[PDB]
Write a protein that binds this ligand. Sequence first.
Ligand SMILES: [Zn+2]
Lengths: 94, 52, 44, 248
Amino acid sequence: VNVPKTRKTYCKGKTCRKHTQHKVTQYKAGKASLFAQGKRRYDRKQSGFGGQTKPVFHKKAKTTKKVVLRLECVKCKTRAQLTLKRCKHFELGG
Amino acid sequence: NHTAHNQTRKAHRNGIKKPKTYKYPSLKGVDPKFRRNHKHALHGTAKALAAA
Amino acid sequence: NPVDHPHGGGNHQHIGKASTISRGAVSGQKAGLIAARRTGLLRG
Amino acid sequence: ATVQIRQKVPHKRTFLFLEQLILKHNAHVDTISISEAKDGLDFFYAQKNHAVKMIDFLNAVVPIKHKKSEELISQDTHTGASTYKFSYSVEIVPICKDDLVVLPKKLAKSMGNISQFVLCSKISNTVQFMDPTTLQTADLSPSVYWRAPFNALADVTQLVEFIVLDVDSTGISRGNRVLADITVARTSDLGVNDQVYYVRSHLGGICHAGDSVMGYFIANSNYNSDLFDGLNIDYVPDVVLVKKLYQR
RNA sequence: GAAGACAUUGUCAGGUGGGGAGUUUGGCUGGGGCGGCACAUCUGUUAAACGAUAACGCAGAUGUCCUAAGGGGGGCUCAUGGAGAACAGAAAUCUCCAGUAGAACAAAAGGGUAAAAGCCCCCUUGAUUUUGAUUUUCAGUGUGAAUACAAACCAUGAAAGUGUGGCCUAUCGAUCCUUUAGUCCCUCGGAAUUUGAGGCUAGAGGUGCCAGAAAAGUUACCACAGGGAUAACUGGCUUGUGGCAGUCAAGCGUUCAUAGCGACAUUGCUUUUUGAUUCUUCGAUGUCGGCUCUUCCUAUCAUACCGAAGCAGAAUUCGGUAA
RNA sequence: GUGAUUUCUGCCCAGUGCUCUGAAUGUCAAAGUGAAGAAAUUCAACCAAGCGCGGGUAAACGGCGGGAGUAACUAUGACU
RNA sequence: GCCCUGAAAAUGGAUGGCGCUCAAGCGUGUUACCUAUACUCUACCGUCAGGGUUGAUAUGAUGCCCUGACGAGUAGGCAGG
RNA sequence: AGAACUGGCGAUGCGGGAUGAACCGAACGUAGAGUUAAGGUGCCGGAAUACACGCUCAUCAGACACCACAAAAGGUGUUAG
RNA sequence: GUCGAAUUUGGGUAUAGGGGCGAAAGACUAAUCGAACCAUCUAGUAGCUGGUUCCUGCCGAAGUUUCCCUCAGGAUAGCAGAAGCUCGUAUCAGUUUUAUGAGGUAAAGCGAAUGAUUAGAGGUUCCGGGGUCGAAAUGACCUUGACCUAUUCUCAAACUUU
RNA sequence: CACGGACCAAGGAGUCUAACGUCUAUGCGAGUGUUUGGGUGUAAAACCCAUACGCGUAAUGAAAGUGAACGUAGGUUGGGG
Ligand SMILES: [Zn+2]
């Protein structure tokens, strides 16, 4: 698939609430910080004897990801998130 | 593996019942532009016939 | 029988795995040649 | 008896190479019939002996894993010796000849501490990999493969072609190949854009300036595999060149 | 006498560690096991003119592809045939005539479509925001996909209108965890500020065994609970195949269709065998052959009596009664 | 491990083991060091054994298949 | 149309048996007759439904009385004993 | 082996098909009388060795559907056309 | 079978249960051994077998839908009983008629698609694909790819007008 | 020709508790519940009782928080009496 680097979409911003123009990028996930509550609880549960106490998922079957676009309004810098279908190739139409 | 024997006898033991119509069906699925005005028409008719 | 020895068991009398055990092997595995740098006859 | 040859891959490349070389080696001397299947085929035999001979032939050119199962045709008494229907399940390694593979971490550390992001380079009784960025080679046997199997990242049908804009041959050569600093441009990009890509290809002598080459493009791709998501994204190249598209 | 602040010992940390410990080692299924996925789905047919309807029934398909192949508008007509034109022919480009779709519409099959839904050209982002109602599978739950509006904001067109992705029918995913977007909103509970963390509303990362455990073998030393729901010997049903009997008998038997044998195909039998189910026995019906001994059948090898032959006698052949 | 005596015990160190008195940074935990910050923390360098590289070892586990060419025609339990 | 051949299997045996031949067989027709827990009428038991009776008689109506219909049953439910 | 509709057995006795879970008749409180169903009426066995027109003689006749095996091909045997 | 010894044997003593001891059979360890015996946790758990105790009356089924590591089991809907409640002959009904819709099965017609057509007179268009090798500069082979004009054959049988 | 049963006597299997759902009877009723405890007693009974507490009278949101009359507590259609 291909997407243009800009598109005029409805901005939900308080000052805009109209079709303004957004710059689109691909959404990449964060860094998965170590003080998240389900990480502190996981570390406390794993510390000791008993071995692996949580399931480790193995049987992967998908071969693609859903593409999330982050859309930043050029007027008020409010961002939105669209999602497309699964594709194997994705670039931005500069 | 999907034998439909005895199913119609089971269906007809306790009857196959109609959905029991009423006066004034629900205005929940109708056009909202019509329903918004029908509220005001009913209110105006009630306020007219109240003081008559 | 395979209770009695690391070499035991089988439908033929063979060791099965390599008979040069390691030096850092634990007590109960050291049944063979313990830290064998060489093996075999050299020339005779 | 029968042998059922399978490969869980759409483009049956090594399977097509095998059915090419069976006519050269002439191993089809005792074949009763040749039945097709979903993604392999079936060879049927009137005896266990040519089933074992066909498996012994396949185990010298194809990376396989095989079993043997049985159905009792008839228990003939007064002898105690029944007759049998035997079925062998010959399964080929699903990595084809020019396939982008992300190896497992401990497997890549085992085979010579090769880079984890490799190509396949030769299919034989063992499977040969190749780092493209350094001329480095590794070998994986089928027995070691099937203990913890894995599938290729990108198929040969995911190849996109490029135009070789520069070959800088200032690399280190092993036999038959030489490392380089090839500057390529994609032939959906030159003509509209003006940007290029630098790679350290292993095709540093097989292609010259101007010609068309074919390879993978990681920058526009969209992968979902945990082995690739464990890789350091700062060290995965954008383009991996696999083969030159020699026009004739 | 040697060694000496090194060994030793104590606590953490990495490697090694079936020597040992605890576990697990999917489902469907003309037995189990391979193979396949009939495990989540789509089209035609099974399917018997509403709907519903099964099989490891059959013929295929899905896990993709597209910033246009989405949206709007304007021009135009397609496959193919014929007639003509330098090189030019089967088959390059141009012109006319006929042309109900015999073309094309990303991809299976089915439906649909001609001033189009096809082919070109122009402009665009309705592939957007808010959440409700409805249809399909259905418990009238979820997921997926669609349908018709409402309140915004837009696109396109002169306009009516159309547009909430793909002409329609498939193209996909819960809790826990992580992460992003938003009011920059709530909380950190003695009171504050700033990091940090936790919430709310919408998405993403994934379970394809697709309503979604984290999982290798062997046992001929084996064990338990049960099962004729289900294989094992026996039987019951079945005749594809095994045997025999008749039916037309091409020809062969020295031109001698039958003294005998042999074609195509054809009707049918017996359980004395190969197979097919799983009906009876899984809180046991002792499992091959031989030895021994009795009885029955005839589909007659010999003996008895007949008949017919390329039956001179002799020896044979075939048939009839006959156990 | 093999199993008196006699007579022999061929060829393979690629694989899997074992080993090394070989290179040295490629990976590499805790502690320690440095940098940013108000600090919790985060990042970076260094980095022991081990792994990886290189060598040895078959009376260690084990393994001991094929094809082409050598002129008139043949391909040798030969030579390539 | 009927009959015969074609039509062969193993303990002795099966229109159910004896037996039957202008049938006691086969095809067809006409009557008479036999009998189920079924139909009709009657009696009784029970269940259900409808109605009458606190004139006041044993203050009780839990009863008493009139009428009609009905009665199979595993797993199971309920009720009266 | 797998489906579609109905009826039934399972859960169901009774008369008949000799006997049989499924077929025919008919569904069941306890008795009496009458009449019938399906099936029968030589004897076992309750009931016509009834009546009427024909066919068949079988050196393994044939006799109540499900149903308890039967074909192709022949017989100037007999009858009718 | 062996019988002067790797002999047989008494008494003492040592080794104790995931342990011992074994000239090795998973053998022996008090008639117990592919993990002894005793007591307790313990009335271990069992979707699996067996049993489940009085009478009569009335009503009376299901073996099917959906989901489940689900197929000797659950949940769920259905069938069924009981309790009733609001009413009083309404609204209805495994049925017919009248009016008006939907269907594409039987029948009816029907002629063509290539494999199996017994393929002839043959066409020779030489159209490439795929795979291996290829300091791919040049390109080799394993190959497969087309019959060609009319048109065979009694229905193989695709499909629809009604 | 599936499993248990040679016979007889006695024993022998849906119980109790904690928290609940539907239904019913009772008491009080915007309240209700004495029995943890105290008083008292003819002494594990019966009788009497203060404060609290439980449930109910008010919901909604993750939370900070906010918190139920336009009106003879509304209009229409049925509705027993
Ligand atoms: Zn904005």
